[PDB]
Amino acid sequence: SIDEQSLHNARRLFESGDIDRIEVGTTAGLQQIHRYLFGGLYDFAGQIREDNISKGGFRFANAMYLKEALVKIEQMPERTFEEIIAKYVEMNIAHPFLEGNGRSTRIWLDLVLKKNLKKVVNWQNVSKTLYLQAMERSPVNDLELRFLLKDNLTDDVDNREIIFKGIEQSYYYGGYE
Amino acid sequence: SIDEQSLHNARRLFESGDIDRIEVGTTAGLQQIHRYLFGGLYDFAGQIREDNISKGGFRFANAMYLKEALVKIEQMPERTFEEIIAKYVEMNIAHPFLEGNGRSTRIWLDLVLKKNLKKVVNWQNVSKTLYLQAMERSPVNDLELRFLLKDNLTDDVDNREIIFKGIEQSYYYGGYE
Ligand SMILES: Nc1ncnc2c1ncn2[C@@H]1O[C@H](COP(=O)(O)OP(=O)(O)NP(=O)(O)O)[C@@H](O)[C@H]1O
Ligand SMILES: Nc1ncnc2c1ncn2[C@@H]1O[C@H](COP(=O)(O)OP(=O)(O)NP(=O)(O)O)[C@@H](O)[C@H]1O
Ligand SMILES: [Mg+2]
Ligand SMILES: [Mg+2]
């Protein structure tokens, strides 16, 4: 039900045009996204975590230096696809919230791609299994992730079907329907 | 041959008493150890790396925020075995040099244990296979490492056989003889 309400928030972010007022490629902008999706649902919406977390055998950036890491991550360049993916990979390693990192940071990635390349990821055609494998591998080698995403870019960045079917797939990655 | 010369340096560190002049539990003290073992052998002896490195599927702390991470890691408490191991685990995640992290940081760990608990690890009885597995797991859960090391502590901290057979085993962990 938390997931269902945040899915409505995600849809409203785009329907309302509020997506166009989110700061692009910064820590604050990621926090804006997270606050929009999870405000009133998670107590920690928008807030940088103070606890440590791991998933599938990988420990995300230690909370004691997470703030410092985010200051450096947000300054990374965004000129090319390769640089943008590298920045995304580091933001994923940071994993700045207790929950909802995946959904918020994918929206954050699309904004950076859209601003710098005039493209976004056509998530509806990006397999859950291949996406999750590629993300798990990305800290060591982002080849899997680059191969996957580059083949699924679209320049039709405001198309309703791409946007809304993409949001649905994004939520599916986290286990919702 | 680099390994053989640094093994002589490691032995001399203890034989000479120079070990007693190394700063305990700090980043600078780890750099002193590394400089002592590898000075004149690696160009980067004592120097915090600027490149990224991974091993066995784990990416060590990103070079762009490594300095910041080390400032926080060195401030971690050292009062109990559990705290000391937690500090060691984070220093291993930092992996501040291009090479020689294992050998230098194990000496660094013994100094912290010796200062705070009046014990050191009896490395000669600590299996290579179990040690390397336990270190690989430690970022997610340090249970393996704690179980292994706690069973192999000794209060005979200046005993020549414990020290020199321990150095030999430490070098063996890295693949030397
Ligand atoms: N072992 C791992 N290493 C690196 N990244 C991972 C790992 N496991 C999961 N991830 C990423 O972390 C994200 C999940 O973080 P989480 O805070 O659960 O976000 P979410 O929005 O709640 N769920 P999701 O829809 O899966 O992104 C996923 O998008 C994965 O790509
Ligand atoms: N996948 C991993 N995750 C976490 N730590 C690891 C991993 N692989 C190796 N290590 C640790 O990293 C150390 C090796 O770092 P390195 O810079 O090669 O030091 P070294 O002194 O040259 N060799 P060693 O004698 O094995 O410690 C080892 O002591 C391991 O315990
Ligand atoms: Mg989640
Ligand atoms: Mg080595």
Residue numbers in the entry:
A (entry chain A), B (entry chain A): 13 to 189
The authors write:
The ubiquitous FIC domain (pfam 02661) found in proteins of all domains of life and viruses has only recently been shown to confer ATase activity. The vast majority of Fic proteins are characterized by a conserved HxF[D/E]GNGRxxR active site motif and catalyses adenylylation, an enzymatic activity that involves nucleophilic attack of a target hydroxyl group onto the α-phosphate of ATP. Helices α4 and α5 are joined by a loop that together with the N-terminal cap of helix α5 forms the active center represented by a signature motif with the consensus sequence HxFx(D/E)GNGRxxR. For the comparative structure/function study on the inhibitory mechanism of Fic proteins from the various classes we chose as representatives the FIC domain of VbhT (residues 1 to 198) from Bartonella schoenbuchensis in complex with its cognate antitoxin VbhA (VbhA/VbhT(FIC); class I), Fic protein SO_4266 from Shewanella oneidensis (SoFic; class II) and Fic protein NMB0255 from Neisseria meningitidis (NmFic; class III).
In fact, a truncation mutant of the class III Fic protein from N. meningitidis (NmFic) lacking the entire C-terminal αinh helix showed strong ATase activity and allowed to study the catalytic and inhibitory mechanism in detail. To reveal the underlying inhibition relief mechanism, crystal structures of the three mutant proteins in complex with ATP or AMPPNP were determined to high resolution. For NmFicE186G this is not surprising, since the complex structure has been obtained by soaking and auto-adenylylation would require partial unfolding of αinh carrying the modifiable tyrosine (Y183). Since we do not see adenylylated residues, the extend of modifications may be either minor, locate to flexible loops or only the unmodified fraction may have crystallized. Figs. 3A–C show that in all three cases, the nucleotide is well resolved and, in contrast to the wild-type complexes, shows a unique conformation and relative position within the binding site. In all structures, the α- and β-phosphate moieties form four H-bonds with the four exposed backbone amide groups of the compound anion binding nest at the N-terminal end of helix α5. In all the structures, a magnesium ion is present albeit with high B-factor for NmFicE186G (63 Å2). Overall, the three structures display a unique mode of ATP binding that can be attained only in the mutants, since the γ-phosphate effectively adopts the position that is taken by the inhibitory glutamate in the wild-type proteins. Most relevantly, the reorganization of the triphosphate in the binding site results in a α-phosphate orientation that is now prone for in-line attack by an incoming target side-chain.
